[PDB]
Write a protein that binds this ligand. Sequence first.
Ligand SMILES: FCCC1CCN(c2ccn3c(n2)nc2ccccc23)CC1
Ligand SMILES: FCCC1CCN(c2ccn3c(n2)nc2ccccc23)CC1
Ligand SMILES: FCCC1CCN(c2ccn3c(n2)nc2ccccc23)CC1
Ligand SMILES: FCCC1CCN(c2ccn3c(n2)nc2ccccc23)CC1
Ligand SMILES: FCCC1CCN(c2ccn3c(n2)nc2ccccc23)CC1
Ligand SMILES: FCCC1CCN(c2ccn3c(n2)nc2ccccc23)CC1
Ligand SMILES: FCCC1CCN(c2ccn3c(n2)nc2ccccc23)CC1
Ligand SMILES: FCCC1CCN(c2ccn3c(n2)nc2ccccc23)CC1
Ligand SMILES: FCCC1CCN(c2ccn3c(n2)nc2ccccc23)CC1
Ligand SMILES: FCCC1CCN(c2ccn3c(n2)nc2ccccc23)CC1
Ligand SMILES: FCCC1CCN(c2ccn3c(n2)nc2ccccc23)CC1
Ligand SMILES: FCCC1CCN(c2ccn3c(n2)nc2ccccc23)CC1
Ligand SMILES: FCCC1CCN(c2ccn3c(n2)nc2ccccc23)CC1
Ligand SMILES: FCCC1CCN(c2ccn3c(n2)nc2ccccc23)CC1
Ligand SMILES: FCCC1CCN(c2ccn3c(n2)nc2ccccc23)CC1
Ligand SMILES: FCCC1CCN(c2ccn3c(n2)nc2ccccc23)CC1
Lengths: 73, 73, 73, 73, 73, 73, 73, 73, 73, 73, 73, 73, 73, 73, 73, 73, 73, 73, 73, 73, 73, 73, 73
Amino acid sequence: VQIVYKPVDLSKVTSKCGSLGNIHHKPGGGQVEVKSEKLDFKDRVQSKIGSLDNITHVPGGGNKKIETHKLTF
Amino acid sequence: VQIVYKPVDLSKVTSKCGSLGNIHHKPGGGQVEVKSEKLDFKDRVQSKIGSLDNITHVPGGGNKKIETHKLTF
Amino acid sequence: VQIVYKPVDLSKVTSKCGSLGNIHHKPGGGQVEVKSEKLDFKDRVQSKIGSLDNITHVPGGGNKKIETHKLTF
Amino acid sequence: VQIVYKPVDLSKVTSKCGSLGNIHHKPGGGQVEVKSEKLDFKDRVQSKIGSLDNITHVPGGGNKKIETHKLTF
Amino acid sequence: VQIVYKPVDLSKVTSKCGSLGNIHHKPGGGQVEVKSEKLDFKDRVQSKIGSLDNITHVPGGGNKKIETHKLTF
Amino acid sequence: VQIVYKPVDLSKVTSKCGSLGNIHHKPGGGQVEVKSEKLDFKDRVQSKIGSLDNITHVPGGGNKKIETHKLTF
Amino acid sequence: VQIVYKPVDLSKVTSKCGSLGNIHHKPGGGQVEVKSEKLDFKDRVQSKIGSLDNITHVPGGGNKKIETHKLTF
Amino acid sequence: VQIVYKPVDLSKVTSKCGSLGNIHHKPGGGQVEVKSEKLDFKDRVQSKIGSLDNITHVPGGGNKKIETHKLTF
Amino acid sequence: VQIVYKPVDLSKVTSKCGSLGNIHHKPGGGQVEVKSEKLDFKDRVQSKIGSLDNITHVPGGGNKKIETHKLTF
Amino acid sequence: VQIVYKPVDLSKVTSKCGSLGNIHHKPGGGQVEVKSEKLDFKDRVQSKIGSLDNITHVPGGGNKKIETHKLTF
Amino acid sequence: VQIVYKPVDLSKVTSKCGSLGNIHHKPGGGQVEVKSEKLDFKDRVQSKIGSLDNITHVPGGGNKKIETHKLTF
Amino acid sequence: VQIVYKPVDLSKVTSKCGSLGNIHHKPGGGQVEVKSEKLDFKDRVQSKIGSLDNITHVPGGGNKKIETHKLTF
Amino acid sequence: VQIVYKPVDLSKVTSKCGSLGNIHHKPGGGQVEVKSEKLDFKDRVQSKIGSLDNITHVPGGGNKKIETHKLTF
Amino acid sequence: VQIVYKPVDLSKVTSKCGSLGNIHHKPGGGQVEVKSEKLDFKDRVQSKIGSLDNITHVPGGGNKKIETHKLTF
Amino acid sequence: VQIVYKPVDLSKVTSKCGSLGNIHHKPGGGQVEVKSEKLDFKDRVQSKIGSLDNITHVPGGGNKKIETHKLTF
Amino acid sequence: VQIVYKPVDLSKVTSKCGSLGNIHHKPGGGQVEVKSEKLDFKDRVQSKIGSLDNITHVPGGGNKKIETHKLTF
Amino acid sequence: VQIVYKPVDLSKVTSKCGSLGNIHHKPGGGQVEVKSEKLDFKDRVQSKIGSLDNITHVPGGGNKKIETHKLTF
Amino acid sequence: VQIVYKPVDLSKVTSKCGSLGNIHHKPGGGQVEVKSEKLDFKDRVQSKIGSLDNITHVPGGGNKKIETHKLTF
Amino acid sequence: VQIVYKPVDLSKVTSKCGSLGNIHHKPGGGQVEVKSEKLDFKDRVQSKIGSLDNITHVPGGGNKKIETHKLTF
Amino acid sequence: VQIVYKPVDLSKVTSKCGSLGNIHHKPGGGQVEVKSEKLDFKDRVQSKIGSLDNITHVPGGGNKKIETHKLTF
Amino acid sequence: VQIVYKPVDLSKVTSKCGSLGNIHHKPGGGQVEVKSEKLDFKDRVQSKIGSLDNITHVPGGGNKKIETHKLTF
Amino acid sequence: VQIVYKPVDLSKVTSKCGSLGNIHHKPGGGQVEVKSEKLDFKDRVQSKIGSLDNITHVPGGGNKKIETHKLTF
Amino acid sequence: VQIVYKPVDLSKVTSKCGSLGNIHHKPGGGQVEVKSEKLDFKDRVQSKIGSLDNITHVPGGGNKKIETHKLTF
Ligand SMILES: FCCC1CCN(c2ccn3c(n2)nc2ccccc23)CC1
Ligand SMILES: FCCC1CCN(c2ccn3c(n2)nc2ccccc23)CC1
Ligand SMILES: FCCC1CCN(c2ccn3c(n2)nc2ccccc23)CC1
Ligand SMILES: FCCC1CCN(c2ccn3c(n2)nc2ccccc23)CC1
Ligand SMILES: FCCC1CCN(c2ccn3c(n2)nc2ccccc23)CC1
Ligand SMILES: FCCC1CCN(c2ccn3c(n2)nc2ccccc23)CC1
Ligand SMILES: FCCC1CCN(c2ccn3c(n2)nc2ccccc23)CC1
Ligand SMILES: FCCC1CCN(c2ccn3c(n2)nc2ccccc23)CC1
Ligand SMILES: FCCC1CCN(c2ccn3c(n2)nc2ccccc23)CC1
Ligand SMILES: FCCC1CCN(c2ccn3c(n2)nc2ccccc23)CC1
Ligand SMILES: FCCC1CCN(c2ccn3c(n2)nc2ccccc23)CC1
Ligand SMILES: FCCC1CCN(c2ccn3c(n2)nc2ccccc23)CC1
Ligand SMILES: FCCC1CCN(c2ccn3c(n2)nc2ccccc23)CC1
Ligand SMILES: FCCC1CCN(c2ccn3c(n2)nc2ccccc23)CC1
Ligand SMILES: FCCC1CCN(c2ccn3c(n2)nc2ccccc23)CC1
Ligand SMILES: FCCC1CCN(c2ccn3c(n2)nc2ccccc23)CC1
């Protein structure tokens, strides 16, 4: 039995910008209320219970390249 | 038995912009109310219970290239 | 038995823009109410129970290229 | 037995724009009410129970190219 | 037995625009009410129970090219 | 036995526009009420129970090209 | 046995427009009421129970080209 | 039995920007309230119960390249 | 039995920027309240109960390259 | 039995910036209150109960390269 | 049985910056209150109960390269 | 000259009801448009130009008694 | 000259009700548009230009008694 | 000359109710637009230009008694 | 000349209620827009230009008694 | 000349209630926009330009008695 | 000339209530925008330009008695 | 000439209540924006330009008695 | 000439309450922005330009009695 | 000429309360911004420009009695 | 000429309370920004420019009695 | 000419309280910024420019009695 | 000419309290910044420029009685 695995990749994820500019993020605070009694979490459970979050993500150049090579017998 | 795997990729995910400009995000805070009794989470469960979230994602250049190579016997 | 797998790809996902401009996002906060008793989640379940979320996604250049190569015996 | 797999692709998903312009998103907050008793989720179930969400997606250049190569024996 | 698979593709999904212009989205918040007792979800079920959502998708250049190559024995 | 599969495609899905213009979307919020008791969903069921949604999709250049190549033995 | 499959396609789905213009969408919110008791969904069933939705789809250039190549033995 | 695994990658995730500009993040503090009785967490569970968080992520140049090579016998 | 594992990688995750600029982060302090009785955490559980956190991450040049090589017998 | 493991990597995670600029972080102190009775932590549990934290991370040049080589018999 | 393990790495995590600039961090002191009764910690548990912490991390040049080589029999 | 004015009134405007009951008012929002150029109002003029009004007047007991006594010389 | 004015009134405007009941007012928001150029109001003029108003007046007991006594020489 | 003015009034505007009940007012927000150029108001003019108002007046006991005594020479 | 003015009033504006009950006022926020150029107000003019107001007036016992005694020579 | 002014008043504006009850006021925030150029106000003019106001007036016992005695020569 | 002014008043504005109850006021924050150029106010002018105000007036016992005695020669 | 002024008043503005109860006021912060150029105020002008105010006035016993005695020659 | 002024007043503004109760005021901080150029105030002008104020006025017993006696020659 | 001024007042502004109770005032800090150029104040002008103020006025017994006696020749 | 001025006052502004109770004032610090150029104040002008003030006024017994006696010739 | 001025006052501003109780004032420090250029103050002008002040005024017994006697010729 | 001035006052401003109790004042330090260039103060001007002050005024018995007697010729 013979196996060959030679994937070739040559990619350019380019990102050119002159100038983003004046970005404003002025949220008004709200109100959040959560009421529970019992929590039982197991086996890779990620939770977010009760949140008032503000994020201003302004990256000059945003590029994500994902490659998942796999091989099984 | 013989196997060959030589996928060739040559791609340019280009992104050109002169200038984004004046971006404004001025939300007014609302109200959220959640009421529960029991929670039972298992086996890769991700939850978001109660949220008032504001996000201003302004990346100059947004490009995501996903490649999933697989091979099984 | 002989197998050959040589897919060739050469693609340019171009994106040219002069200037986005003045983008405004001024939402008025509403009201959300959720009432439950019992939750039982399992086996790759993602939930969003109760949310008042505002997002302003303004990426200069948006391009996503997905390739899923597979091969099984 | 002999197998050959040489798909050739050469595509340009072009996107040219001079300037988007003045985009405004001014929603008025409404009201949402959800009432349940029991939830039982399993086996790749994604839910959204109770939401008042506003999104302003303004990407300069929007282009998604999907290719799903498969081969089975 | 002999098999050959050489599909050739050469396509240009062009998109040219001078300027989008002044786009306005000013919805008035309504009211939504959902009342249930029991939920039982399984095996690739995605639900949206109770929503008041506003989206302003204004991408300069919108082009999606889908190719699904398959081959089975 | 011999098999040949060489489909050739060369297509240009062009889209030219000078300027979209002033687009306005000013809906008045209505009222929605849904009342149920039991839900039992299985095997690739996607539902939308209770919604008051407004969308303003204004892409400069809208072009989708779908190709589904298949081959079975 | 011999098989040949060489379909040739060369098509231009052109779309030229000078300027769309002033498009207005001003709906008045109505009222919707749905009343049920039991729901049992299975095997690729997609439902929309209770909706008051407004959409303003104004793409400069709308062109969709679908090709379904098939071959079976 | 023979196995070969020589994947070649040569990719440039470029990110060019002239100047980001004046970015402002002025959120108004809201209110969050969470009430529970018992918590039972196990086996890779990460939770966030009660949060009012503001983040201003402005990286000049944002590029993440992920490669997951795997091989099993 | 013979095994070879020679993956070659040559990638440049470049990030060029002229000058970020004047970045301001002026949040207004809110209020957070969490009330529980018993906590039982085990087996790789990370929690964040009660937080009012502000972060201004402004790295000139942000680039993360992840490679996970694996091999099992 | 023979095994070879010679992965070659040659990557440059470059980060060039002219000058970050005037970065300001002026948060207003909020209020946090957490109330519990009993805590029982075990087996790699990291918690953060009650926090009002401000961080201004401004590194000139941010680049993290992670490589996880593994091999098992 | 023979085993070879010769991974070669040659990477330059460069970070160039002209001058960071005037960075200001002027937080306003808030208030934090935590109330508990009993704590029981064991087996690699790190906790942070009650904190009002301010950090200004401004390193000229931030670059972390992690390599985890492993080999087991 | 002699004048006498002694009007005697003794009236009971009774209103008895056991229970009104379940009264529902669920109008569907219409559309109104008024276009004018000049308005000139004087000397006890009350106007209502442009209205979409809903009123649910349910008074338990409705009784109005009007008496206009007058006398002139 | 002699004048006498002795009007006697003895009236009971009674209103008895056991219980009003469940009154519901669920209007759907419409749309109103008014366009004018010049307004000139004088001398006891009350106007209402542009209104979308909902009122639910449910007074237990509604009784108004008006008496206008006058006398002139 | 002689004048006498002795009006006698003895009235009971009674209002009895057992219990109003469950009153609900759930309007859906509409849209109002008013456009003018010049306004000139004088001499006891009260105006309401542009309004979306909701009122729920539920007074237990509503009774207004008006008496206007006048006398002139 | 002789004048006498002895109006006698003896009135009981009674208001009895057992219990109002559960009153709910859940309006959905609409949208209001007013556009003018010049305003000239004089001589007892009260205006309300642009309003989205919600009022829930629930007074236990509502009774207003107005008496306007006048006398002139 | 002789003048007499002896108006006698003896009135009881009673208001009895057992218990108001559970009153809820949950409005959803809308949006208001007013645009003017010049304002000229004089001589007892009270204005309200631009308002989104919510009031919950629940006085146990509401009774206003107005008496305007006047006399002129 | 002789003048007499002896108005007698004996009034009881009573207000009895057992218990108001659970009153809730949970408004959702909206958005207000006012734009003007010049303001010229004189001679007893009170204005309110731009307001988002919430008031919960719950006085146990509300009674206002106004008497305006006047006399002129 | 003779003048007499002996107005007699004997009034009891009573207010009895057993217990107000649980009153809650949880508004969600909105957003207000006012833009002007010149202000010219004179001669008893009180203004409120730009306000987001919340008031919870809960006085046990609210009673205001106003008497304005006047006399002129 | 003779003048007499002997107004007699005997009034009891009573206020009785058993116990107010649990009053809560939990507003969510909004956002206010005011922009002007010139201010010119004179002659008894009181202004409030820019305010985000919260007040919880809970006086046990609220009673204000105003008497304005006047006399002129 | 003779003048007499003997106004008699005998009033009891009583205020009785058993116990106020648990009063809570937990506002969330918002954001205020005021921008002006020139201020010119004269002749009894009191201003408040820029304020984020919280007051909890809880006086046991609130009673203000104002009397303004005047007399002029 | 003769003048007499003998106003008699005998008033008891009583205030009785059993016990105020547990009063809490926990505001969250906001943010205030004021920007001006020139200030010119004269002739009894009191100003407050820029303030974030919290006051908890809890006086057991609050009673203010104001009397302004005046007399002029 | 004769003048008499004998105003008699006999008033008891009583204030009785059993015990105030547990009063807490826990504000969270905010942020204040004021920017000016020139200040010119004259003729009884009191100003407060820039303040973050907390006051807890809890006087057992608060009573202020003001009397302003005046007399002029 | 004769003048008499014999105002008699006999007032008791009483203040009785059993015990104030546990009063706590725990403010969190904020931040204040004031920036000016020139100050010119004259003629009874008192200013407070830049202050972060905390005061806990708890006087057992607070009573201020002000009397301003005046007389002029
Ligand atoms: F289960 C706990 C972890 C989950 C929930 C929290 N995360 C996110 C991530 C992104 N978004 C988001 N939430 N809400 C969003 C609203 C609009 C746009 C993007 C949004 C991470 C995943
Ligand atoms: F089942 C939970 C996940 C589902 C439901 C939520 N998602 C979406 C995505 C898109 N849209 C949407 N909802 N509503 C829409 C209305 C108009 C236009 C687009 C819309 C993701 C899929
Ligand atoms: F089952 C849960 C996931 C489903 C339902 C939600 N999604 C969508 C997507 C698009 N639209 C939509 N809903 N409603 C629409 C109305 C008009 C136009 C487009 C619309 C995603 C699929
Ligand atoms: F369990 C006790 C040890 C834990 C908790 C404390 N640590 C940290 C570390 C980083 N961050 C953080 N906390 N909070 C953050 C908020 C924003 C951004 C970064 C933040 C170390 C890990
Ligand atoms: F000119 C400005 C003042 C006018 C117009 C507004 N008012 C009203 C009052 C009552 N109704 C009404 N409008 N429309 C109605 C429709 C049905 C039933 C009753 C209605 C007060 C008087
Ligand atoms: F000119 C400015 C003042 C006018 C107009 C506004 N007012 C009102 C009052 C009552 N109603 C009303 N408008 N519209 C209504 C619709 C149905 C029922 C009652 C209604 C007060 C008078
Ligand atoms: F000109 C500025 C002052 C005017 C207009 C505003 N006021 C009101 C008062 C009452 N209502 C009202 N408006 N609209 C209403 C709709 C339905 C029912 C009652 C209504 C006070 C008078
Ligand atoms: F001109 C500036 C002063 C005017 C306008 C503002 N005021 C009010 C008062 C009462 N209402 C009202 N507006 N709108 C209303 C809608 C429904 C019911 C009652 C209403 C006070 C008078
Ligand atoms: F001109 C500046 C002063 C005016 C306007 C502000 N005031 C008010 C007072 C009462 N209300 C009101 N506005 N709007 C209202 C809506 C519904 C019910 C009552 C309302 C005081 C008078
Ligand atoms: F011109 C500057 C002074 C004016 C305006 C501010 N004041 C008020 C007073 C009361 N209310 C109000 N505004 N808005 C309100 C809304 C609903 C109910 C009551 C309301 C005092 C008078
Ligand atoms: F011109 C500067 C002085 C004016 C404006 C500020 N004042 C007030 C007073 C009371 N209220 C108010 N504003 N807004 C309110 C909203 C609802 C209820 C009551 C309200 C005092 C008078
Ligand atoms: F011009 C500078 C002096 C003026 C403005 C500041 N003052 C006040 C006083 C009372 N209130 C208020 N403002 N805003 C309020 C909102 C709701 C209720 C009461 C309110 C004192 C008078
Ligand atoms: F011009 C500088 C002096 C003025 C302004 C400052 N003062 C006040 C006084 C009282 N309040 C207030 N401001 N704001 C308030 C908000 C709600 C309730 C009461 C309020 C004193 C007078
Ligand atoms: F011009 C400089 C002197 C002025 C301003 C400062 N003073 C005050 C006094 C009282 N308050 C206040 N400010 N702000 C307040 C907010 C709520 C309640 C009461 C308040 C004294 C007068
Ligand atoms: F101009 C310089 C002298 C002025 C300003 C400083 N003083 C004060 C006095 C009282 N208060 C105050 N400031 N701010 C306050 C906030 C809330 C309550 C009371 C307050 C004395 C007068
Ligand atoms: F101009 C320099 C002298 C002035 C300013 C300083 N003084 C004060 C006095 C009292 N207070 C105050 N400042 N700030 C306060 C805040 C809250 C309550 C009371 C306060 C004395 C007068």
